[PDB]
Amino acid sequence: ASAGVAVTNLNLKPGHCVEIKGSIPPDCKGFAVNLGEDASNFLLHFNARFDLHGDVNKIVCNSKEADAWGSEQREEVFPFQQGAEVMVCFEYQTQKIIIKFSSGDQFSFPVRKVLPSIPFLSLEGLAFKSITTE
Amino acid sequence: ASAGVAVTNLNLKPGHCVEIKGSIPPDCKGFAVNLGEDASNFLLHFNARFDLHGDVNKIVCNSKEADAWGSEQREEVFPFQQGAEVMVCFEYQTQKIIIKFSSGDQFSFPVRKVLPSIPFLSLEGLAFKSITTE
Ligand SMILES: OC[C@H]1O[C@@H](S[C@@H]2O[C@H](CO)[C@H](O)[C@H](O)[C@H]2O)[C@H](O)[C@@H](O)[C@H]1O
Ligand SMILES: OC[C@H]1O[C@@H](S[C@@H]2O[C@H](CO)[C@H](O)[C@H](O)[C@H]2O)[C@H](O)[C@@H](O)[C@H]1O
C-alpha cells in the first residue's frame, strides 16, 4: 500500500549513519531499504520479508552491480510485525555496514564496493516518517 | 557550487506537512528549499537570502513552471543565522502552502497549481540533517 521514497545526494560517508523511522502496512509482504548509487547499483539491499519469494519472516541482504544481484546473506532475527513501526539505523564503515534496530538487535553486511560516500537511498513498501543523518 | 539533497516520491497530499532540518554554513549567501514536480517546476521555491542579488536578510518565494519563474513574493521576517541550524515546516492545503519557522513565525504562499500530491523536494546550499512527514 505504497511506493517508496527516493533520496539522492545523500552523500553518506564512512563513519556516519542514516536512521529511517517508518511504518509497515498491515498487509506488507515485505519491505526494502536500498543504499547505493542508483536503482541498478546497491551497496546494500536490505529486504525484510514477511511472506515473499519463499521467505517467511526472514531478512535478506545483498548488493547489486549493473542490474545483477550478488550473493545473499540471510538473517534469522526478524524483530518486525506487519502494521508496526520500524526504526532502523545504518552505519557506514569501509569494511561493513552495521544495521541496528530499536529492538537492540544488530548485525552487519560486508561492503563489496567501497564508495567514498553513498549517494542514493530508496525505500519500498515502507511508509516513511522521517530520515536522519549523523 | 553547493545544492544538496533531492527527495522524490515525497507524496505530500493536502492536509499534510514536511519539516526540514539542517545546517546553514557560516559563509552562506542564501539557501533554498524547493517543493513541486521536478527541477523545472516548483509549486514553491523558498529562498532565504542573507546577502544575494541586492536582497539582504530577506525571504523570496516564487513558483516555477517549465523553468519560467512566476511572481516573487518577498517577506521581511528572517529568523536565520549563518553557521547555525535551521528547521522549517511546510503544510500543504489545496489553496495555499503554510510555512512555519521554529520561531513560531508563519506565512503562506498561494498554490498556483493544485497537484493531487507533491512528488518532489530539494535543498540548495543547506546541510541536510533530517526530513519528517506528518
Ligand atoms: O537478493 C535480493 C533479491 O532477491 C530476489 S528473490 C531471490 O531470487 C533468487 C533467484 O534468482 C533466489 O530464489 C533467492 O532465494 C531469492 O531471495 C528479489 O526478487 C529481489 O527483489 C531482491 O530482493
Ligand atoms: O524568483 C526567485 C528566483 O529569483 C532569481 S533572482 C531574480 O531575478 C529577477 C530577474 O531575472 C529579478 O531581478 C528578481 O528581483 C530576482 O530576485 C534567482 O536566481 C532564482 O534562484 C530564484 O531565487
UniProtKB/Swiss-Prot annotation, chains A, B:
One Pfam family from the UniProt entry? Gal-bind_lectin
Please state the protein's primary subcellular location. Answer: secreted
Q: Which GO terms describe its cellular component?
A: extracellular space
Q: What is this protein called?
A: Galectin-1
Q: Which cysteines are joined by disulfide bonds?
A: none
Gene3D superfamilies named in the record: 2.60.120.200
Taxonomic lineage = Eukaryota, Metazoa, Chordata, Craniata, Vertebrata
The listed locations are:
Secreted, Extracellular space, Extracellular matrix
Quote the record's binding site residues for a beta-D-galactoside.
Answer: 45-49, 53, 62, 69-72
Q: Which InterPro entries match?
A: ConA-like_dom_sf (IPR013320), Galectin-like (IPR044156), Galectin_CRD (IPR001079)
So what does this one do?
May regulate cell apoptosis and cell differentiation. Binds beta-galactoside and a wide array of complex carbohydrates.
Q: Which residues carry this modification: N-acetylalanine?
A: 1
Domain of life, per UniProt, equals Eukaryota
